[PDB]
């Protein structure tokens, strides 16, 4: 039902902010985008840029992904990202996360046509 593109958007795109507002951003957002449904996703990253800017990363620096595939792309500029890490206290279904804001280059895995991001690989 949901496409790879769509999933990327849902899990990682939060254009409606320039940075995780409070310190309870991950808890609210992780839960509201269904990343805590079957279990607590250990780590997640949201990107606080426009869709267009993130989808343009597929045209930038071609890098190897972590799994070995070579269709990964690193952003020229640095972007506003929020690292969401699961605490120790967290336990399904009460998922607890620590919000860690940062500005780094995002590495994404791109595919399909239009050639859009389908997976968030790394931030560097």
């Amino acid at each position, epitope marked *: 039902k949901e496409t790879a593109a769509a999933k990327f958007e849902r899990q990682h795109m939060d254009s409606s902010t320039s940075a995780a507002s409070s310190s309870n951003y991950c808890n609210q957002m992780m839960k509201s985008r269904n990343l805590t449904k079957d279990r607590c996703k250990p780590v997640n990253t949201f990107v606080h840029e426009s869709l267009a800017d993130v989808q343009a990363v597929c045209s930038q620096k*071609n*890098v*190897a992904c972590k799994n070995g*595939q070579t*269709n990964c792309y690193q952003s020229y500029s640095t972007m506003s990202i929020t690292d969401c890490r699961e605490t120790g206290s967290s336990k399904y279904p009460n998922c607890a996360y620590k919000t860690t804001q940062a500005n780094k280059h995002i590495i994404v895995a791109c*595919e*399909g046509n239009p050639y859009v991001p389908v997976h968030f690989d790394a931030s560097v």
Partner: nanobody
Amino acid sequence: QVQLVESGGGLVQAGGSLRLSCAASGYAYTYIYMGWFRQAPGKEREGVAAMDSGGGGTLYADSVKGRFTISRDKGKNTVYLQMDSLKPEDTATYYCAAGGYELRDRTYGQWGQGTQVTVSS
């Protein structure tokens, strides 16, 4: 604006040879993987051969192994396809592609416009 320009297409006799050329213009870095795909009239696009930017992680479709050779200028955005012992079956429009993985069609986001290669019985 990155263009992928291909050349070398032609019409040849069964058993003859052709050489396909492709260079990426306007790309600041080097695409790890560059390869060739082809689409026979009506049918679906299929991968022909691919190689990475270093010596190679070369890969060939089963129909062209031993007849076609791919090559890249080490560290550059160029791909070549020497096509020997061409056969009617090879008639198709060949496409150069960059920035993908192996022969995985969906992973390639930079596509040439296509070069017709026709081999007559």
